[PDB]
Amino acid sequence: NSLDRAQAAKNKGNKYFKAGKYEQAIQCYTEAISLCPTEKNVDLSTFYQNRAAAFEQLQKWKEVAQDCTKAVELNPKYVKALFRRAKAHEKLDNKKECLEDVTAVCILEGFQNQQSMLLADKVLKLLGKEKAKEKYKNREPLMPSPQFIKSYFSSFTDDIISQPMLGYLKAKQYMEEENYDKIISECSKEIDAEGKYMAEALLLRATFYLLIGNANAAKPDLDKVISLKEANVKLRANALIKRGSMYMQQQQPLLSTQDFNMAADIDPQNADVYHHRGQLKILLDQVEEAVADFDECIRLRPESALAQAQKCFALYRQAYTGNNSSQIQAAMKGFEEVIKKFPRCAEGYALYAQALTDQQQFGKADEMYDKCIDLEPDNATTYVHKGLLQLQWKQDLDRGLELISKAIEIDNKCDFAYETMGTIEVQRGNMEKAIDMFNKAINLAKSEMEMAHLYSLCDAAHAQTEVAKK
């Protein structure tokens, strides 16, 4: 009965444990370690894990990881020992080791334990945020394509800075000639000389700071345009739109809405404010606030195809969230009415295809994406949409890779496509090629938040290969 003597020592250590006498419980567990036959892996791993619990209440995290480690050697799939070591590594700032332990925990649990997944999600965000910060320091900025720049400014009508010409004047001519890399220089000459186009150059320089991914240099310019009350209200409203979007990009919903609300108050008929705020309201699932902004866009732009396509999709999300099939079909038929009234609005088809995919009509959604290729053949994002469709629809990873690769041929500076290709290589099991695609998107991401998400995908991939080695 040599094993009964080990459990007897373990059971008295449990009574010291419940009385708060952890040092005396540790000695009983140590006595149980000695009396357990080496042939009994499970019982011996139990005794090590119990002693790690006593070390945990004393908050001696080093001894916790040590005892959990020995317990895993006897019971390699001891989920309680692996998870306790993951918590121990978190306290010791062993984030990579904590991620690897909690990765094995989630796999053994079938991803069914919210407690384990919250810990993995917590350490993944921290690891990705750290690397995104250090990489964003000395990252060289890339100027996006002219097609992206013109599409960005075409989403504004009241910005002034994009208007044609009838320091800053030289910057406006470099812009009309698509020589964007020298716009920031000529704008600084106005600000340094404090000319009459000072607020415009301050706003135009901040815009291209954002366009090259330098949100840290755009913030002081946006702050300054907003502080100048004498400046044109159109320039302050446009600067508040861009500072609010940057706030939302940095996970600041409250400051974002404050800037958008102030933009609407100081410039009540600026349709850019209602257009860009409503798009954020949809992303935040604040639907009734979105239709209100999109209804104002229609009121201010009664002939705009996109404005009615927006509101039609906003009405759909309202029916989708309330789950009335009568209202859902009402808004679904509204899409077919929008595409007939505006047959060359590609976003009308894309918003419809999203609603079709949300409601399982994949074949018709692929047709709407095909129509976008007819109208706009050089739009790479539509091929990303078709690729994402092939994953949700048929799980055809080969055809999905070909469509995502097609978007790269059109726009090799599309970080969204590289992220989708790495996601596919994870699903196929090619972890090294997946990290390869994630890194190419990192060097292309436009914000630090996007870069942190991509770095998290890398650490999750690397952690799985380490778990695979055992």
Partner: protein, 36 residues
């Protein structure tokens, strides 16, 4: 976690939420996750 992309249409920003969901399932549907 709203990952907002600069200068993108609404349909593209909607696809980010779809990509996030597909990334979660991709890591749960890897050879190492099923063989353990």
């Amino acid at each position: 976690p709203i990952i907002l992309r600069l200068g993108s249409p609404l349909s593209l920003n909607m696809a980010r939420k779809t990509l996030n969901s597909l990334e979660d399932k991709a890591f749960q549907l890897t050879p190492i996750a099923v063989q353990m």
